[PDB]
Every structure is written in C-alpha cells, then in structure tokens.
Amino acid sequence: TISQAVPPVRDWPAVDLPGSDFDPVLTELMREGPVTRISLPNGEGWAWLVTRHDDVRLVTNDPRFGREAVMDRQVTRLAPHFIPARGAVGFLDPPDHTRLRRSVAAAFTARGVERVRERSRGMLDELVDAMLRAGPPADLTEAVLSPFPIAVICELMGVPATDRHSMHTWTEMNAYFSDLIGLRSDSAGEDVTSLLGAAVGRDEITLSEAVGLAVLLQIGGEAVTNNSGQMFHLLLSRPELAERLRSEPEIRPRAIDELLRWIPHRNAVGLSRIALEDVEIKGVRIRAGDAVYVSYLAANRDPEVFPDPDRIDFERSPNPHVSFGFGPHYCPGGMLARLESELLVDAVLDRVPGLKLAVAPEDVPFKKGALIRGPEALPVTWHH
Ligand code: HEM
Ligand SMILES: [NH3+]CCC[NH2+]CCCC[NH2+]CCC[NH3+]
C-alpha cells in the first residue's frame, strides 16, 4: 500500500581516481539502497541505477530492457557523446543483435580461443625476449601490455600483420576489413574474419554490419592492456600477491578471475538500457521509457555474493563475477581476455628476474578523463 518515495537524484561528476582506488561516490550509492537515481556529466536528465548482484543480473538479462531505445534521446551519460549511433552491436536488440553475435560466437568461446593459445604464447615470448635484451628500465605497458593484445586479436581475426598502427592511432581499418570480409566471404575458415565473411555471404548479416563488429573486436584489446595493467600494478605494489602466484602457479587461473572481479575496470557506468514496459525492482516502479544503468563494479563487491568483497582472495570459492557483463550483451572477449591474462602472468612473473616497480606505487600514472581505467605507463625494473 504505502507509497515509497523515489530516491533523490545523485549527481556523479567526472573525477580522476588514483590507481585502482574505489569511487567514493559509487560507494555512497551502494550504501543508499538497491535502487538509486543518477545524473552524469553529459546527456540530459536522470537514470536509474542498480548496484546489487541480483538486480544487475536481472536488468542485463531481462528482455524487457532494450538498447535500441537509448538512441531515441539524450540519456544522461559519462561520455561526451554517443557517436556509435546505430549499427554498433552495443546499440542493437535481439533481432539484429543476435544475428551479429551469433556470426562470431564460436571463435570466442572457451574452446574457440584455445585455438590461438600456442601462437599467442610464442608471440608473448618474443615481446619479453626483446624487453629482456634491451635491459631493465622498461615501461611494461609499451613493451608488452599494449602490443600483446593486438598481436593476439590479429591471430584470432585471421589477419596477417601491420594493422597495429591504425589501432594505436585510434586513440582506414573500416575499409581494410570491408575488403577482407567482403572479398573472401564464403570460405569455411575458422578465424573471425572468415566467419563474418561467410555470414555476409549467407545474407545472415550485412557487409557494413560485419565491418563494424570487426573493428570493435580488433581494437577491444586495449581493454586487456588497461585491465592487465591494473593487474600488474597490484601484483607489484602488493608483493604477497605476486609471491603467491610464483609459489602456487596452479592457482593462477582462479587468481586471475579474482583480480578481474576486484579491479575497477571503468569510471562510473557505461551504456544504459531502456525499460520497454513497466518493471518492478525491489519495490521501485521503473516506468517504460526510463533509462536504467547497472554497475558491474558495484555488483562485484556485493557483500552477500562475495563475502569480504574488498579483499583479494585467490582462493575465493563461488566467484560469479560480472566483470565481462551479463545477459545478451556480455563481453565476447571475456574468454580471450582470460587467456591473454593467463599467458601474461606466466611470462611476466616467470621470466623477469627481480621484477618490481621502478617508481613508488602512487607515482604510476593512470589515465585521466577516461572511460576505461588503467595505467598510462607501468615503469618496471629488474636484474639484468
Ligand atoms: C579484461 C578485459 C575486458 C573487460 C573487463 C571487458 C568488459 C566488458 C563489459 C563490462 C562490457 C559491457 C556489457 C554490457 O553491455 O552490459 C563489454 C562489452 C563488449 N566487449 Fe569487452 N571487455 C574486455 C575485453 C574485450 C576484448 C579483448 C574485446 C574484443 C575481442 C571485447 C569486446 C567487447 C564487445 C564487442 C562488447 C559489446 C558486446 C555487445 O554489446 O553485444 N572486450 N566488455
Ligand atoms: N622506488 C623504486 C625504485 C627502485 N630502484 C631499484 C634499483 C634496483 C634494481 N634492481 C632490482 C632487483 C630487485 N632485487
């Protein structure tokens, strides 16, 4: 019966957070209740926000919330603008979205990404070989964390090599993939570009649709560069973590998933969803048309799902984190990201004698005015 007053609209200004420190404003919101309302720097008005693990899964996996409708107005957001108007996989719903994700799904499953494990391991060794030959002072990001993800995706996409330059500038290729995809599009290849090529041939997807997806995947590696950057900043600044991984290599896969759960991958929240019809969440009525954001970072610190949520526990048993999202729009690169992280931890922790930061932890530069958090550089040193 009794009316439940709507939450006050909380303003969430863009703030550059140090290292991997948690956003105090998000903490405030997490403590206010499961359903809040926020207003970000750009776009207009307010949007709902859910922070609990169960509500985050509900909103991201329920058909009643859509992505296409976000383009119908200026939904309050962190990013200055929403250039990927239409066509981008993130802004598509079940009909078109499903066709697009299905065309390449097989290459990104656990078994799919295992295809490039061997070659990727070798590619990483060449990068580490070079860093070691050059001598101790090194920016781990520039020498390994940045180039490795790019090399890996090229192998998975089924592209030869030199596409990196364009990738770094993206900080051209649209035309490149248009060629490869639309000029080979029917081979039974297993690589991503072949799969897309084939799909386009079977009228499953459009050439433009295929190119757009190809571009997102090709440059999605920076996410691993930034995230793994935080992983190593943590492993080096907190030696007990690195020493446990050197002491018990068997725990590396689980440790990596725990690091992925904890690391605050982005600033604020990303892309909202629109309630296509009225929806009830924890006694709150979300009206059709309202925007609803989910915070995967907050969800990953849910005290019920992850007891002692702020502690990094490599032995954490049930670890259903949502760092790669949830629902239909869940990250296609999640399995590939775990593979890259696994190879990186192996190489960095086993092949660099006496590895440590070349500066105080607080002196490592992190990206400012960014959407995805991470170091701009990670200076390290070791015994030559
Ligand atoms: C540890 C590194 C990564 C993290 C933490 C991460 C995280 C995320 C998250 C949280 C989303 C949003 C899900 C949503 O909309 O609810 C997402 C989407 C996406 N990610 Fe990643 N990602 C990572 C690496 C990658 C890589 C390497 C690629 C490229 C192979 C990639 C490609 C994508 C794409 C294409 C989407 C959009 C999916 C869709 O809307 O259907 N991600 N990612
Ligand atoms: N504030 C960090 C600066 C560290 N400078 C270290 C010079 C020594 C390099 N050898 C490191 C091997 C570790 N046992």
CSV table of C-alpha atoms and ligand atoms in Angstrom, one decimal:
chain,number,residue,atom,x,y,z
A,1,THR,CA,0.0,0.0,0.0
A,2,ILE,CA,2.1,2.9,1.4
A,3,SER,CA,4.0,5.0,-1.1
A,4,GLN,CA,7.7,4.5,-1.4
A,5,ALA,CA,9.3,7.8,-2.3
A,6,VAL,CA,11.7,7.8,-5.3
A,7,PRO,CA,15.4,8.2,-4.4
A,8,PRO,CA,17.0,11.7,-4.7
A,9,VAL,CA,18.8,12.3,-8.0
A,10,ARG,CA,22.5,12.0,-7.1
A,11,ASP,CA,25.0,14.0,-9.3
A,12,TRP,CA,28.0,12.0,-10.4
A,13,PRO,CA,30.8,14.3,-11.7
A,14,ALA,CA,33.7,13.0,-13.6
A,15,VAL,CA,36.7,12.6,-11.2
A,16,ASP,CA,40.1,11.1,-11.9
A,17,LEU,CA,40.6,8.4,-9.3
A,18,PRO,CA,44.2,7.4,-8.2
A,19,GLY,CA,45.4,3.9,-9.2
A,20,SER,CA,42.8,1.3,-8.5
A,21,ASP,CA,41.0,3.1,-5.7
A,22,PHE,CA,37.3,2.7,-5.5
A,23,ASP,CA,35.0,5.5,-6.5
A,24,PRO,CA,33.6,7.0,-3.2
A,25,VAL,CA,30.5,8.3,-5.0
A,26,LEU,CA,29.7,4.7,-6.1
A,27,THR,CA,30.3,3.6,-2.5
A,28,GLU,CA,27.8,6.2,-1.4
A,29,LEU,CA,25.2,5.0,-3.9
A,30,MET,CA,25.8,1.3,-2.9
A,31,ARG,CA,25.0,2.3,0.7
A,32,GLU,CA,21.8,4.2,-0.1
A,33,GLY,CA,19.7,1.3,-1.2
A,34,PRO,CA,19.5,-1.2,-4.1
A,35,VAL,CA,17.8,1.3,-6.5
A,36,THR,CA,19.1,4.9,-6.9
A,37,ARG,CA,18.9,7.7,-9.5
A,38,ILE,CA,21.9,9.4,-11.0
A,39,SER,CA,22.7,12.3,-13.3
A,40,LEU,CA,26.0,12.1,-15.2
A,41,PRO,CA,28.1,15.0,-16.9
A,42,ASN,CA,26.7,14.7,-20.4
A,43,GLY,CA,23.3,13.8,-21.9
A,44,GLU,CA,20.3,15.1,-20.1
A,45,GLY,CA,18.2,14.3,-17.1
A,46,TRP,CA,18.5,11.3,-14.8
A,47,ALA,CA,18.6,7.5,-14.9
A,48,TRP,CA,18.0,4.6,-12.5
A,49,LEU,CA,21.0,2.7,-11.1
A,50,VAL,CA,21.2,-0.8,-9.7
A,51,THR,CA,24.2,-2.0,-7.7
A,52,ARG,CA,23.2,-5.4,-6.2
A,53,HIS,CA,24.4,-8.5,-8.0
A,54,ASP,CA,20.9,-9.9,-8.3
A,55,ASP,CA,19.4,-6.7,-9.7
A,56,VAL,CA,22.3,-6.2,-12.1
A,57,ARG,CA,21.8,-9.7,-13.5
A,58,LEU,CA,18.0,-9.0,-13.8
A,59,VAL,CA,18.4,-5.8,-15.8
A,60,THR,CA,21.1,-7.1,-18.1
A,61,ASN,CA,19.3,-10.4,-18.9
A,62,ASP,CA,15.6,-9.4,-19.0
A,63,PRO,CA,14.0,-9.0,-22.4
A,64,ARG,CA,12.0,-6.0,-21.1
A,65,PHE,CA,15.1,-3.8,-21.2
A,66,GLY,CA,16.4,-2.6,-24.6
A,67,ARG,CA,19.4,-0.9,-26.1
A,68,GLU,CA,18.0,0.4,-29.4
A,69,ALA,CA,15.8,2.9,-27.5
A,70,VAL,CA,18.8,4.6,-25.9
A,71,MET,CA,19.3,6.4,-29.2
A,72,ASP,CA,15.8,8.0,-29.0
A,73,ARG,CA,17.1,10.9,-26.8
A,74,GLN,CA,20.0,12.3,-24.8
A,75,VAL,CA,20.2,9.8,-21.9
A,76,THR,CA,22.4,11.1,-19.1
A,77,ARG,CA,25.9,9.6,-19.6
A,78,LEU,CA,29.6,9.9,-18.8
A,79,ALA,CA,30.9,10.1,-22.3
A,80,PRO,CA,30.8,13.4,-24.1
A,81,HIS,CA,28.7,11.9,-27.0
A,82,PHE,CA,27.2,8.7,-28.5
A,83,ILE,CA,28.9,8.6,-32.0
A,84,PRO,CA,28.1,4.9,-32.4
A,85,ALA,CA,24.5,5.9,-33.3
A,86,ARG,CA,23.1,2.8,-34.9
A,87,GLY,CA,24.6,-0.4,-36.2
A,88,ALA,CA,27.1,-0.9,-33.4
A,89,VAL,CA,26.5,-4.2,-31.6
A,90,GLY,CA,26.1,-2.4,-28.3
A,91,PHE,CA,23.1,-0.4,-29.6
A,92,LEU,CA,21.3,-3.4,-31.1
A,93,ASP,CA,18.5,-5.6,-29.7
A,94,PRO,CA,17.7,-9.3,-30.1
A,95,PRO,CA,16.7,-9.4,-33.7
A,96,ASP,CA,19.8,-7.8,-35.3
A,97,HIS,CA,22.0,-8.2,-32.2
A,98,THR,CA,21.5,-12.0,-32.1
A,99,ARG,CA,22.5,-12.3,-35.8
A,100,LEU,CA,25.6,-10.3,-35.3
A,101,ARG,CA,26.8,-12.0,-32.1
A,102,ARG,CA,26.0,-15.5,-33.5
A,103,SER,CA,28.1,-15.0,-36.6
A,104,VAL,CA,31.4,-15.0,-34.5
A,105,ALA,CA,30.4,-16.6,-31.2
A,106,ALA,CA,32.2,-19.9,-31.9
A,107,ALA,CA,35.6,-18.1,-32.1
A,108,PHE,CA,35.2,-16.5,-28.7
A,109,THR,CA,34.0,-19.4,-26.5
A,110,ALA,CA,36.5,-21.1,-24.1
A,111,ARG,CA,37.2,-23.8,-26.8
A,112,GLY,CA,37.2,-21.2,-29.5
A,113,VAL,CA,40.0,-19.0,-28.1
A,114,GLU,CA,42.1,-22.1,-27.2
A,115,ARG,CA,43.0,-22.2,-30.9
A,116,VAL,CA,45.3,-19.3,-30.7
A,117,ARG,CA,46.9,-20.1,-27.3
A,118,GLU,CA,50.1,-21.7,-28.7
A,119,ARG,CA,50.9,-18.9,-31.1
A,120,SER,CA,50.0,-16.3,-28.6
A,121,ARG,CA,52.3,-17.8,-26.1
A,122,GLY,CA,55.1,-17.6,-28.7
A,123,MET,CA,54.2,-14.1,-29.6
A,124,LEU,CA,54.4,-13.1,-26.0
A,125,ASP,CA,57.8,-14.7,-25.6
A,126,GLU,CA,59.2,-12.7,-28.5
A,127,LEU,CA,58.0,-9.5,-26.8
A,128,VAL,CA,59.5,-10.5,-23.4
A,129,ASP,CA,62.7,-11.6,-25.2
A,130,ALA,CA,63.0,-8.1,-26.7
A,131,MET,CA,62.4,-6.4,-23.4
A,132,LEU,CA,65.0,-8.5,-21.6
A,133,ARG,CA,67.6,-7.9,-24.3
A,134,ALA,CA,67.1,-4.2,-24.1
A,135,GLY,CA,67.8,-4.1,-20.4
A,136,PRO,CA,66.0,-3.3,-17.0
A,137,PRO,CA,64.4,0.1,-17.2
A,138,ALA,CA,61.1,-0.6,-19.1
A,139,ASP,CA,57.5,0.6,-19.5
A,140,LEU,CA,55.7,-2.8,-19.2
A,141,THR,CA,52.7,-1.3,-21.0
A,142,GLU,CA,54.6,0.0,-24.0
A,143,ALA,CA,56.8,-3.1,-24.2
A,144,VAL,CA,54.3,-5.9,-23.6
A,145,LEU,CA,50.8,-5.0,-22.3
A,146,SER,CA,49.9,-2.8,-25.3
A,147,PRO,CA,51.4,-4.8,-28.2
A,148,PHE,CA,50.4,-8.3,-27.0
A,149,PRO,CA,46.6,-8.0,-27.1
A,150,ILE,CA,46.9,-6.5,-30.6
A,151,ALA,CA,49.0,-9.4,-31.8
A,152,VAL,CA,46.6,-11.9,-30.3
A,153,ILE,CA,43.4,-10.5,-31.8
A,154,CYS,CA,45.1,-10.4,-35.3
A,155,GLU,CA,45.7,-14.1,-35.0
A,156,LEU,CA,42.1,-14.8,-33.9
A,157,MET,CA,40.7,-12.4,-36.6
A,158,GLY,CA,42.8,-14.2,-39.1
A,159,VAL,CA,44.7,-11.2,-40.3
A,160,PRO,CA,48.4,-11.2,-41.3
A,161,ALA,CA,50.1,-8.2,-39.5
A,162,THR,CA,50.7,-4.4,-39.6
A,163,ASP,CA,47.1,-3.4,-38.5
A,164,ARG,CA,48.6,-2.2,-35.2
A,165,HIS,CA,49.5,1.3,-36.4
A,166,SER,CA,45.9,2.1,-37.2
A,167,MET,CA,44.9,0.6,-33.8
A,168,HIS,CA,47.2,2.9,-31.9
A,169,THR,CA,46.1,5.9,-33.8
A,170,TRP,CA,42.5,5.0,-32.8
A,171,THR,CA,43.5,6.8,-29.6
A,172,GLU,CA,41.0,3.3,-42.6
A,173,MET,CA,40.7,-0.1,-40.9
A,174,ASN,CA,37.0,0.1,-41.7
A,175,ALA,CA,37.9,0.0,-45.3
A,176,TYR,CA,40.5,-2.8,-44.7
A,177,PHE,CA,38.1,-5.2,-43.1
A,178,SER,CA,35.5,-4.3,-45.8
A,179,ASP,CA,38.0,-5.8,-48.2
A,180,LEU,CA,39.0,-9.0,-46.3
A,181,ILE,CA,35.4,-9.7,-45.1
A,182,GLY,CA,33.7,-8.8,-48.4
A,183,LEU,CA,36.5,-10.3,-50.5
A,184,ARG,CA,36.7,-13.9,-49.2
A,185,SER,CA,33.3,-14.2,-47.8
A,186,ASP,CA,32.3,-17.8,-48.2
A,187,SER,CA,35.5,-19.7,-47.1
A,188,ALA,CA,35.0,-22.3,-44.4
A,189,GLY,CA,37.7,-20.6,-42.3
A,190,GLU,CA,37.6,-20.8,-38.5
A,191,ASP,CA,39.1,-17.3,-37.9
A,192,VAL,CA,36.7,-14.4,-37.1
A,193,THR,CA,37.0,-12.6,-40.5
A,194,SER,CA,36.2,-15.8,-42.3
A,195,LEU,CA,33.2,-16.4,-40.1
A,196,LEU,CA,32.0,-12.9,-40.8
A,197,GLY,CA,32.8,-13.3,-44.5
A,198,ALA,CA,30.7,-16.4,-44.6
A,199,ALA,CA,27.8,-14.9,-42.7
A,200,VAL,CA,27.7,-12.0,-45.1
A,201,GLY,CA,27.6,-14.4,-48.0
A,202,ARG,CA,24.7,-16.3,-46.4
A,203,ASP,CA,22.8,-13.0,-46.1
A,204,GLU,CA,22.9,-13.6,-42.3
A,205,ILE,CA,24.5,-10.2,-41.8
A,206,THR,CA,25.3,-7.1,-43.9
A,207,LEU,CA,28.8,-6.2,-45.1
A,208,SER,CA,28.6,-3.0,-43.1
A,209,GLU,CA,27.4,-4.8,-40.0
A,210,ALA,CA,30.3,-7.2,-40.3
A,211,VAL,CA,32.9,-4.5,-40.7
A,212,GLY,CA,31.6,-2.6,-37.7
A,213,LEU,CA,31.8,-5.6,-35.5
A,214,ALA,CA,35.3,-6.5,-36.9
A,215,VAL,CA,36.5,-3.1,-35.9
A,216,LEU,CA,35.2,-3.3,-32.3
A,217,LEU,CA,36.8,-6.7,-31.8
A,218,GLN,CA,40.1,-5.7,-33.4
A,219,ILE,CA,40.6,-2.7,-31.0
A,220,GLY,CA,38.9,-4.3,-28.0
A,221,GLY,CA,42.3,-5.4,-26.8
A,222,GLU,CA,43.1,-2.1,-25.1
A,223,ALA,CA,40.7,-3.3,-22.5
A,224,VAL,CA,43.1,-6.1,-21.7
A,225,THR,CA,46.0,-3.6,-21.9
A,226,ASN,CA,44.3,-1.4,-19.3
A,227,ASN,CA,43.0,-4.2,-17.1
A,228,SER,CA,46.1,-6.3,-17.1
A,229,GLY,CA,47.9,-3.0,-16.4
A,230,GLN,CA,45.9,-2.8,-13.2
A,231,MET,CA,46.6,-6.4,-12.5
A,232,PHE,CA,50.3,-5.9,-12.6
A,233,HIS,CA,50.2,-2.7,-10.7
A,234,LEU,CA,48.5,-4.7,-8.0
A,235,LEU,CA,50.9,-7.7,-8.2
A,236,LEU,CA,53.9,-5.4,-7.9
A,237,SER,CA,52.6,-3.0,-5.3
A,238,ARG,CA,51.4,-5.9,-3.2
A,239,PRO,CA,54.2,-8.4,-3.3
A,240,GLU,CA,52.3,-11.0,-1.3
A,241,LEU,CA,50.1,-11.4,-4.3
A,242,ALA,CA,52.9,-12.0,-6.8
A,243,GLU,CA,54.7,-14.3,-4.4
A,244,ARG,CA,51.6,-16.5,-4.0
A,245,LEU,CA,51.4,-16.8,-7.8
A,246,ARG,CA,55.1,-17.8,-8.0
A,247,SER,CA,54.6,-20.2,-5.1
A,248,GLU,CA,51.4,-21.8,-6.4
A,249,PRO,CA,51.3,-21.5,-10.2
A,250,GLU,CA,48.3,-23.8,-10.1
A,251,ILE,CA,46.2,-21.1,-8.7
A,252,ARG,CA,46.9,-18.6,-11.5
A,253,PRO,CA,43.6,-19.2,-13.4
A,254,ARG,CA,41.5,-18.6,-10.3
A,255,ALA,CA,43.7,-15.7,-9.1
A,256,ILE,CA,43.2,-14.0,-12.5
A,257,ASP,CA,39.4,-14.4,-12.1
A,258,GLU,CA,39.6,-12.9,-8.6
A,259,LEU,CA,41.7,-10.0,-9.9
A,260,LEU,CA,39.2,-9.5,-12.7
A,261,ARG,CA,36.4,-9.4,-10.1
A,262,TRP,CA,38.1,-6.8,-7.9
A,263,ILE,CA,39.8,-4.4,-10.4
A,264,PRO,CA,37.6,-1.3,-11.1
A,265,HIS,CA,37.8,-1.6,-14.9
A,266,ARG,CA,35.9,1.6,-15.7
A,267,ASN,CA,34.9,5.0,-14.4
A,268,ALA,CA,31.2,5.4,-13.4
A,269,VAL,CA,28.9,3.4,-15.6
A,270,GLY,CA,28.8,2.7,-19.4
A,271,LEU,CA,25.7,2.2,-21.6
A,272,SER,CA,22.2,2.1,-20.1
A,273,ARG,CA,19.1,0.1,-21.1
A,274,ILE,CA,15.6,1.4,-21.6
A,275,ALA,CA,12.6,-0.2,-19.8
A,276,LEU,CA,10.4,-1.2,-22.7
A,277,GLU,CA,7.5,-1.6,-20.3
A,278,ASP,CA,7.0,-1.0,-16.6
A,279,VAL,CA,9.2,-3.1,-14.3
A,280,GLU,CA,9.3,-3.6,-10.6
A,281,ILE,CA,12.7,-3.8,-8.9
A,282,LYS,CA,12.9,-4.0,-5.1
A,283,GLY,CA,9.6,-2.2,-4.6
A,284,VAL,CA,10.5,0.6,-7.1
A,285,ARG,CA,8.4,1.2,-10.2
A,286,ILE,CA,10.6,1.7,-13.3
A,287,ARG,CA,8.4,3.4,-15.9
A,288,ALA,CA,8.5,2.4,-19.6
A,289,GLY,CA,10.9,4.9,-21.2
A,290,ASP,CA,13.2,5.4,-18.2
A,291,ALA,CA,16.8,4.6,-18.5
A,292,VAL,CA,18.4,2.1,-16.2
A,293,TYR,CA,22.2,1.7,-15.6
A,294,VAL,CA,23.9,-1.2,-13.9
A,295,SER,CA,27.2,-1.0,-12.1
A,296,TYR,CA,29.2,-4.2,-12.7
A,297,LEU,CA,31.9,-2.9,-10.4
A,298,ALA,CA,29.4,-2.4,-7.6
A,299,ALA,CA,27.9,-5.8,-8.3
A,300,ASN,CA,31.4,-7.3,-8.0
A,301,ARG,CA,31.6,-6.0,-4.4
A,302,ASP,CA,28.2,-7.3,-3.4
A,303,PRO,CA,28.8,-8.4,0.3
A,304,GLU,CA,26.3,-11.3,0.0
A,305,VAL,CA,27.6,-12.9,-3.1
A,306,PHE,CA,31.3,-12.1,-2.3
A,307,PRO,CA,31.8,-12.1,1.5
A,308,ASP,CA,34.6,-9.6,2.5
A,309,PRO,CA,34.2,-8.1,-1.0
A,310,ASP,CA,37.1,-5.7,-0.8
A,311,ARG,CA,39.6,-8.4,0.0
A,312,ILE,CA,41.5,-10.0,-2.9
A,313,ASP,CA,41.3,-13.8,-2.2
A,314,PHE,CA,42.7,-16.0,-4.9
A,315,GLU,CA,41.0,-19.0,-3.2
A,316,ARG,CA,37.6,-17.3,-3.3
A,317,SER,CA,35.1,-20.2,-3.8
A,318,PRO,CA,32.0,-19.2,-5.6
A,319,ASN,CA,33.3,-16.4,-7.8
A,320,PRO,CA,30.4,-15.5,-10.2
A,321,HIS,CA,31.8,-12.1,-11.0
A,322,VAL,CA,30.3,-9.9,-13.8
A,323,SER,CA,33.4,-8.0,-15.0
A,324,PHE,CA,32.6,-9.2,-18.5
A,325,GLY,CA,29.0,-8.1,-18.1
A,326,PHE,CA,25.9,-10.3,-18.2
A,327,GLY,CA,22.9,-11.1,-20.4
A,328,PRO,CA,23.0,-11.0,-24.3
A,329,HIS,CA,25.4,-8.1,-24.4
A,330,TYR,CA,28.0,-9.8,-22.2
A,331,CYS,CA,31.6,-9.3,-23.4
A,332,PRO,CA,32.5,-11.6,-26.4
A,333,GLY,CA,36.2,-11.2,-25.5
A,334,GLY,CA,35.9,-12.5,-21.9
A,335,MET,CA,37.3,-15.9,-22.6
A,336,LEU,CA,40.1,-14.3,-24.8
A,337,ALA,CA,40.9,-11.8,-22.0
A,338,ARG,CA,41.3,-14.6,-19.5
A,339,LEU,CA,43.7,-16.4,-21.9
A,340,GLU,CA,45.8,-13.3,-22.6
A,341,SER,CA,45.9,-12.6,-18.8
A,342,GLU,CA,47.0,-16.2,-18.2
A,343,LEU,CA,49.8,-16.0,-20.6
A,344,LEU,CA,50.9,-12.6,-19.4
A,345,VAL,CA,51.0,-13.6,-15.8
A,346,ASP,CA,53.1,-16.6,-16.7
A,347,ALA,CA,55.6,-14.6,-18.7
A,348,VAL,CA,55.9,-11.6,-16.6
A,349,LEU,CA,56.2,-13.5,-13.3
A,350,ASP,CA,58.4,-16.3,-14.5
A,351,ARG,CA,60.7,-14.6,-16.9
A,352,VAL,CA,61.7,-11.2,-15.4
A,353,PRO,CA,64.2,-11.8,-12.5
A,354,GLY,CA,63.7,-9.5,-9.6
A,355,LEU,CA,60.8,-7.7,-11.3
A,356,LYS,CA,59.4,-4.7,-9.3
A,357,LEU,CA,58.1,-1.2,-9.9
A,358,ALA,CA,60.7,1.4,-10.9
A,359,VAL,CA,58.6,4.1,-9.0
A,360,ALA,CA,56.5,4.3,-5.9
A,361,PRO,CA,53.1,2.7,-6.4
A,362,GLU,CA,51.4,6.1,-6.1
A,363,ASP,CA,53.7,7.5,-8.8
A,364,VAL,CA,52.5,5.2,-11.6
A,365,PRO,CA,50.4,7.4,-14.0
A,366,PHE,CA,46.8,6.4,-14.6
A,367,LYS,CA,44.6,7.6,-17.4
A,368,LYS,CA,42.7,10.8,-16.8
A,369,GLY,CA,39.3,11.8,-18.2
A,370,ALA,CA,38.9,8.2,-19.3
A,371,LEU,CA,36.0,5.8,-19.7
A,372,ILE,CA,38.2,2.7,-19.0
A,373,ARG,CA,40.6,3.0,-16.1
A,374,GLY,CA,44.2,1.9,-16.2
A,375,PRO,CA,47.8,3.0,-16.2
A,376,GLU,CA,49.2,5.3,-18.9
A,377,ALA,CA,52.5,3.6,-18.3
A,378,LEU,CA,53.9,1.0,-15.9
A,379,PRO,CA,57.6,1.5,-15.2
A,380,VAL,CA,59.3,-1.6,-14.0
A,381,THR,CA,62.9,-2.7,-13.4
A,382,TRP,CA,64.7,-6.0,-12.7
A,383,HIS,CA,68.1,-7.7,-12.6
A,384,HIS,CA,69.9,-7.6,-16.0
B,1,HEM,C1,39.5,-8.0,-19.2
B,1,HEM,C2,39.2,-7.2,-20.5
B,1,HEM,C3,37.7,-6.8,-20.7
B,1,HEM,C4,36.7,-6.4,-19.9
B,1,HEM,C5,36.7,-6.2,-18.4
B,1,HEM,C6,35.5,-6.2,-20.7
B,1,HEM,C7,34.3,-5.8,-20.2
B,1,HEM,C8,33.2,-5.6,-21.0
B,1,HEM,C9,31.9,-5.1,-20.5
B,1,HEM,C10,31.6,-4.8,-19.0
B,1,HEM,C11,31.1,-5.0,-21.5
B,1,HEM,C12,29.6,-4.5,-21.5
B,1,HEM,C13,28.5,-5.5,-21.4
B,1,HEM,C14,27.1,-4.8,-21.5
B,1,HEM,O1,26.9,-4.0,-22.4
B,1,HEM,O2,26.4,-5.0,-20.5
B,1,HEM,C15,31.8,-5.4,-22.7
B,1,HEM,C16,31.3,-5.4,-24.0
B,1,HEM,C17,32.0,-5.7,-25.1
B,1,HEM,N1,33.3,-6.1,-25.1
B,1,HEM,FE1,34.5,-6.3,-23.6
B,1,HEM,N2,35.8,-6.5,-22.1
B,1,HEM,C18,37.1,-6.9,-22.1
B,1,HEM,C19,37.8,-7.2,-23.2
B,1,HEM,C20,37.3,-7.2,-24.5
B,1,HEM,C21,38.1,-7.6,-25.7
B,1,HEM,C22,39.5,-8.0,-25.7
B,1,HEM,C23,37.2,-7.5,-26.8
B,1,HEM,C24,37.5,-7.8,-28.3
B,1,HEM,C25,37.7,-9.2,-28.6
B,1,HEM,C26,35.9,-7.1,-26.2
B,1,HEM,C27,34.8,-6.8,-27.0
B,1,HEM,C28,33.6,-6.4,-26.5
B,1,HEM,C29,32.4,-6.1,-27.3
B,1,HEM,C30,32.3,-6.3,-28.8
B,1,HEM,C31,31.4,-5.7,-26.5
B,1,HEM,C32,30.0,-5.4,-26.9
B,1,HEM,C33,29.0,-6.6,-26.8
B,1,HEM,C34,27.6,-6.4,-27.1
B,1,HEM,O3,27.1,-5.3,-26.9
B,1,HEM,O4,26.9,-7.3,-27.6
B,1,HEM,N3,36.0,-6.9,-24.9
B,1,HEM,N4,33.1,-5.7,-22.3
B,2,LIG,N1,61.1,3.5,-5.9
B,2,LIG,C1,61.5,2.3,-6.8
B,2,LIG,C2,62.9,2.4,-7.3
B,2,LIG,C3,63.7,1.1,-7.3
B,2,LIG,N2,65.1,1.2,-7.8
B,2,LIG,C4,65.7,-0.1,-7.8
B,2,LIG,C5,67.1,-0.3,-8.3
B,2,LIG,C6,67.5,-1.7,-8.1
B,2,LIG,C7,67.1,-2.6,-9.3
B,2,LIG,N3,67.5,-4.0,-9.1
B,2,LIG,C8,66.2,-4.6,-8.6
B,2,LIG,C9,66.2,-6.0,-8.2
B,2,LIG,C10,65.4,-6.4,-7.1
B,2,LIG,N4,66.0,-7.3,-6.0
